[PDB]
Amino acid sequence: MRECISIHVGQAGVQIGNACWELYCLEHGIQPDGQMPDSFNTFFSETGAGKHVPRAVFVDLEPTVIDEVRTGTYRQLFHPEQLITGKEDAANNYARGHYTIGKEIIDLVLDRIRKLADQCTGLQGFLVFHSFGGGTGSGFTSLLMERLSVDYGKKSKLEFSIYPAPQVSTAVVEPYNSILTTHTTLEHSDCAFMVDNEAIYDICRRNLDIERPTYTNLNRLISQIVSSITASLRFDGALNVDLTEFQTNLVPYPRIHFPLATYAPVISAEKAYHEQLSVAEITNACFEPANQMVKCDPRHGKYMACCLLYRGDVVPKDVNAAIATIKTKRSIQFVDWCPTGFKVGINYQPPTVVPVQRAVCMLSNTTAIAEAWARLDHKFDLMYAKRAFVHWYVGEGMEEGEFSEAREDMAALEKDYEEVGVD
Amino acid sequence: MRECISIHVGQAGVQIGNACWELYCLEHGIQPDGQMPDSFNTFFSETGAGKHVPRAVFVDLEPTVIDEVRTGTYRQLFHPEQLITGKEDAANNYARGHYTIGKEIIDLVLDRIRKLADQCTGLQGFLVFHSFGGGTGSGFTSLLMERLSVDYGKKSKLEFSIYPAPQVSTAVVEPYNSILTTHTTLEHSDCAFMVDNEAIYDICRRNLDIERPTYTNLNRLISQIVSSITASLRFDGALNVDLTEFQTNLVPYPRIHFPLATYAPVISAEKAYHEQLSVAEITNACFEPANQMVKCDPRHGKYMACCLLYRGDVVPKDVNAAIATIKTKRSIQFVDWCPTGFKVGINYQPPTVVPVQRAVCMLSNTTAIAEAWARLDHKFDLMYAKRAFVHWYVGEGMEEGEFSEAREDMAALEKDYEEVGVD
Amino acid sequence: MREIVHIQAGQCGNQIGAKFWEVISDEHGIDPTGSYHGDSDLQLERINVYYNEAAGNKYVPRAILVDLEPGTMDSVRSGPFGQIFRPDNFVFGQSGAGNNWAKGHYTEGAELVDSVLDVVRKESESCDCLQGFQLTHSLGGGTGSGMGTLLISKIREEYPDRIMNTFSVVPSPKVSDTVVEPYNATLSVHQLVENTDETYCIDNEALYDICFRTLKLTTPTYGDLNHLVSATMSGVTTCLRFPGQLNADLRKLAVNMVPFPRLHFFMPGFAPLTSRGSQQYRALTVPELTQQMFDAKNMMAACDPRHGRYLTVAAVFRGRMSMKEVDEQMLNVQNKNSSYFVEWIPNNVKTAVCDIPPRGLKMSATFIGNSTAIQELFKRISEQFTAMFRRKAFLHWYTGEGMDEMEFTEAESNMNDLVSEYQQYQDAT
Ligand SMILES: Nc1nc2c(ncn2[C@@H]2O[C@H](COP(=O)(O)CP(=O)(O)OP(=O)(O)O)[C@@H](O)[C@H]2O)c(=O)[nH]1
Ligand SMILES: Nc1nc2c(ncn2[C@@H]2O[C@H](COP(=O)(O)OP(=O)(O)OP(=O)(O)O)[C@@H](O)[C@H]2O)c(=O)[nH]1
Numbered sequence A, B: 001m002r003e004c005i006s007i008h009v010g011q012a013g014v015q016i017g018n019a020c021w022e023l024y025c026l027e028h029g030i031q032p033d034g035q036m037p038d039s040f041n042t043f044f045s046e047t048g049a050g051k052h053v054p055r056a057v058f059v060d061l062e063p064t065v066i067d068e069v070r071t072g073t074y075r076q077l078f079h080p081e082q083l084i085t086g087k088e089d090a091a092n093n094y095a096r097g098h099y100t101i102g103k104e105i106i107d108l109v110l111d112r113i114r115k116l117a118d119q120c121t122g123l124q125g126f127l128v129f130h131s132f133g134g135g136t137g138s139g140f141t142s143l144l145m146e147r148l149s150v151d152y153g154k155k156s157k158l159e160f161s162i163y164p165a166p167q168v169s170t171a172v173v174e175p176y177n178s179i180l181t182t183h184t185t186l187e188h189s190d191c192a193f194m195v196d197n198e199a200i201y202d203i204c205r206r207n208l209d210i211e212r213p214t215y216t217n218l219n220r221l222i223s224q225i226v227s228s229i230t231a232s233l234r235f236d237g238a239l240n241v242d243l244t245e246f247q248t249n250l251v252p253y254p255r256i257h258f259p260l261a262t263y264a265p266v267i268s269a270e271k272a273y274h275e276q277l278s279v280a281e282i283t284n285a286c287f288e289p290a291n292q293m294v295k296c297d298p299r300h301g302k303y304m305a306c307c308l309l310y311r312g313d314v315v316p317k318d319v320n321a322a323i324a325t326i327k328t329k330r331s332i333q334f335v336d337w338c339p340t341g342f343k344v345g346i347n348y349q350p351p352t353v354v355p356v357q358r359a360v361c362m363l364s365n366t367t368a369i370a371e372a373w374a375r376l377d378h379k380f381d382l383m384y385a386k387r388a389f390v391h392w393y394v395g396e397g398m399e400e401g402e403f404s405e406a407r408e409d410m411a412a413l414e415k416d417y418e419e420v421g422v423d
Numbered sequence C: 001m002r003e004i005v006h007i008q009a010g011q012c013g014n015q016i017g018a019k020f021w022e023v024i025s026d027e028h029g030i031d032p033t034g035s036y037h038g039d040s041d042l043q044l045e046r047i048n049v050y051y052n053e054a055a056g057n058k059y060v061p062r063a064i065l066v067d068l069e070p071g072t073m074d075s076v077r078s079g080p081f082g083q084i085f086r087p088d089n090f091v092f093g094q095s096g097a098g099n100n101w102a103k104g105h106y107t108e109g110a111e112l113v114d115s116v117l118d119v120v121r122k123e124s125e126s127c128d129c130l131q132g133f134q135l136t137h138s139l140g141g142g143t144g145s146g147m148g149t150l151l152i153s154k155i156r157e158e159y160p161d162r163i164m165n166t167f168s169v170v171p172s173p174k175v176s177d178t179v180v181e182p183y184n185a186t187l188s189v190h191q192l193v194e195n196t197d198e199t200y201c202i203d204n205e206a207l208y209d210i211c212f213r214t215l216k217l218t219t220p221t222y223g224d225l226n227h228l229v230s231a232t233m234s235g236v237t238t239c240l241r242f243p244g245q246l247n248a249d250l251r252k253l254a255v256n257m258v259p260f261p262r263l264h265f266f267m268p269g270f271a272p273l274t275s276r277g278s279q280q281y282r283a284l285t286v287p288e289l290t291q292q293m294f295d296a297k298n299m300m301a302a303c304d305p306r307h308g309r310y311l312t313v314a315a316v317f318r319g320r321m322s323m324k325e326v327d328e329q330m331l332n333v334q335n336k337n338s339s340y341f342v343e344w345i346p347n348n349v350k351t352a353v354c355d356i357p358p359r360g361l362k363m364s365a366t367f368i369g370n371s372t373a374i375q376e377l378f379k380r381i382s383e384q385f386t387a388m389f390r391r392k393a394f395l396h397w398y399t400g401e402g403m404d405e406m407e408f409t410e411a412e413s414n415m416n417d418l419v420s421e422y423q424q425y426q427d428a429t
């Protein structure tokens, strides 16, 4: 009766969704053919025959990666009216994804939403797997979110996004993407989510015993996070926290909606022993700086709000002693005027494995993330100091002052976390 | 409920620990796989599954001897987050272990302590198996002990160390190690322990019928001592003496904390007969000078305090007559103003064998050990009279007067035992 | 979709394409006839971009061959991969340009251009979606100089959005095979700086060097001279023709690299390179493929990166590979050669990873570089121009075709406008 649809924008989001719906089919026992040999209306719908289809929309301006789903192993799962392709990519040009090509096939993707919104009645959240690296994953992202608040307005819109890395940075105009996309995702998205590529590597290198990771394995870490956020809807625990509450819990002021995800425990197969993984043991590893997936030191700021989504085998009194430890420390410290800073969620379902006992997803809306914007503002100034690459965005119809209008917009964003940090 | 963790510093301490935890697994019936087909929380902890792990931390700056554990027979016993290796050794340079390389991986080893200190609640002592011969076993030893009194301060810190030999001496700058390490282990260690290599040989040669010993067999003698010191915690005798009492019993003044270990009876297999090994027979062999493991004649000074840790099969009245003999002799004599100079400990557990009825560990804080420092001060003067090897410690960042500051520090150490000897 | 139309010119550039389409033949399993024999079905999934699938199990090279004398067209059609082309597309003159730019651009350039611009129109109409046009020619001869440059100005009048790349060989630094090589460079410089989106620039002498330094060859033929550019051109679009862990195409390479439209003159780079037997005694992995690129000797344009400053860096890999093995190597090498780059770009290393290797070795990489080292070659070329111009020699040919000094002078000034702008950002930091 309760639903939560998903949209995938750009090439980086599709390869996230290739591992996500790989995991969801293994959750409810679904085959790649939509077949299984109760309450799962959030991510699936039933046909007239005994087949289930995903509530997913795959958009791309280049026809490459969607053919990898249209010819891959997960081929028969998807409705061919969902698989939407373009012809010419934005090709790491935000003005092409926002003005040139994305304005043409915008009619088809938005029409597929209401075709999914017929059978949905408990519409409780949206999923937009979009990166800020590629132009298609960013230029279409701004055009998509404008119509939905015109469409729904009151319904929830969540973005499990990918943060551009401060050191290991692939493309060139990746600093140009973030400042331009700021005005959309601060005025439409109810709670955006930042994940950096860079912190994943040492988790793969040290904690997962494989120094040289693959992008197939980078998606496996985030796919476990997205499932355990939905662990209250898809199942039944003693304390089920639905997605309406998170945007009401984690948001003290309606502009501040940038937490970070933290999955724990992250172990290897050989290190599955030499440990016991009690509920007090693993939550201290959550607040370890080298276990999070965002390159931000949590002891460089203060926590505004914290959330903990447990699964597996959990007794709350045993967690009650675990939370009592973290308030009674000193290197871990909160925003002082928020003394009630925990949101606990327990599900009695084990964390499934993709080819352990319990697992924790930590969601901490903190002030440690605010330094990451300043590391990216420093990138954007010098490339705009030369007026470099202006003839591509202006070459694809964009105002020069539209950079400058969004330039001060980050300063009003940055002064928020500075103001909340002091008493 | 009561715990006692162990740390191994340098190459010589690891090969001690290779035979120690070999013995502990044979005590409680533990396999090398942490498996066994009650109260042993002192040296072990239980996983979620039925496996137990040792409370041991192996540090080394060279990767050689730790690979001998990482590939040896005792491979699966150890948590791979405990097995800590470096890259470049101190290589018999104390200034490299104290300034150059040991300052880098100091963060990892100290972090493993609090990860062990979670499950510990009756933290009653530390074990640091460090030699004074190698630079890594001495240079890391000073850096390690400074943080722990900042960490704990009140908790017990014990060092089962290896004394450098006055005649059979391997390296060259071994006199340089002892004077530099003096200021740390006299200001942090609650009760240090000296064991010389040289007295072990004649015990192996005469009393053990093998004139040519191996370093595998040298570790077997000290490993029996370390177990019977813990014989009150790990088991139940009629007079259990815990490790809090020893540092309160054996220490009349808080600088004097240098006793010596004496294991007895030390017999061979063919000499297991032609004897009866009564409790009065073997304790006279304890005060024999050729049965101790420190090259110091006990009839060249006076005893300040004595301790006797029995195991096997012991009746205290039968020991009461045995102790009455030793006070009623003349060649064995005490410090006269300490007339109550015995600490007795009985455990009803037999001394286990590594591939008899009773065993005695003797701990005698005496003034006979004070001549061993003067034999090593005589080595250190002439090598510093030439100003030899100054360009390595100064070549690795060390003050010349830091030798001279520690030079008079041994004189204040040496005048302690001289002052207590007279009435 | 996004098909690509191929145009040739000159006499050097045809023999390169006479080897380049042999490279594309075995990168798609294409026989010398025109049929198909490959086994991997990833070839047929994107076969359309360089080939029209003609009627009845056929595949024809979507290519336009242009000469001005029937010799080189006869040599292609008689040798290998000549019957694979369409006989309708052998569009060639009868005179020969006479090694004159003005003959290829004014008198004889106006004749055959109408025959070409229908064939360009016939392919561009037949293509479902059009990506861009590519040209392989000379800058030293007559047909490669005038005839190719006359086309591109007519194409910019047609298509504003379609990309354009010329794999034009730079006139030679020290050897002088062409007597009038400034007069075929400078009059060709002005067309390239106006309306070519990206422009590939290869020195002759470094191609002799790379065939002699790393490989240690004794008798290098043009089948092995020009073969290195043939693998180079294939590595530009190898992320288009096959899927990857990070795909790329000709528009992604353009907007990432070119910082301002007057600075788009690039340099290649290819790895690995061995001998016939000295091929296994080396750890041919990512760090070897890392450090093989960034040295001065791997650049097919003879220029020292130490005597200059980069602006942007692209890198296209081939074959299956991990990422932190690549990424840290693609990050740390910016710090050891730190002062050689420029200040105002953070992380100027563009990475591109396909998932299909060449038919051969397991992994391969294609380097696309941009630096200020190339402008120092033009000061030689401007000196080579003015040495033959301060006496005003060789003018009566161009006077016989009809041209003032100002067209020579402003193009030399526009050559100096290239000088005044690559020096400008080099002086800045
Ligand atoms: N790397 C190569 N350079 C070549 C080759 N053939 C010629 N060249 C160079 O190209 C220049 C000559 O240009 P072309 O071969 O294209 C002569 P083209 O048909 O363009 O015009 P004409 O002078 O009217 O014959 C000159 O600098 C030669 O050194 C070749 O196979 N490889
Ligand atoms: N989460 C995730 N991000 C990835 C992965 N591979 C690449 N990325 C990121 O995606 C960025 C590129 O974005 P893409 O989605 O591939 O490109 P696009 O949105 O389609 O836009 P254009 O292709 O330029 O038109 C890279 O810079 C990386 O930061 C992956 O497997 N997972």
Ligand SMILES: Nc1nc2c(ncn2[C@@H]2O[C@H](COP(=O)(O)OP(=O)(O)OP(=O)(O)O)[C@@H](O)[C@H]2O)c(=O)[nH]1
Residues within 6 Å of the ligand: B009, B010, B011, B012, B013, B015, B016, B062, B089, B090, B091, B092, B093, B131, B133, B134, B135, B136, B137, B138, B162, B170, B171, B197, B215, B216, B218, B219
């Ligand atoms: N107790 C004991 N001591 C040993 C044994 N083998 C050697 N030693 C002593 O160890 C001293 C050398 O110390 P090491 O621990 O090996 O060296 P290190 O501290 O790792 O520093 P390096 O100089 O880098 O090797 C020798 O001089 C011996 O006195 C052994 O089996 N048992």
Ligand SMILES: [Mg+2]
Residues within 6 Å of the ligand: A010, A011, A012, A062, A134, A136
């Ligand atoms: Mg893409």
Ligand SMILES: [Mg+2]
Residues within 6 Å of the ligand: B010, B011, B012, B062, B134, B136
């Ligand atoms: Mg050693």
Ligand SMILES: [Mg+2]
Residues within 6 Å of the ligand: C010, C011, C012, C141, C142, C143
């Ligand atoms: Mg020619």
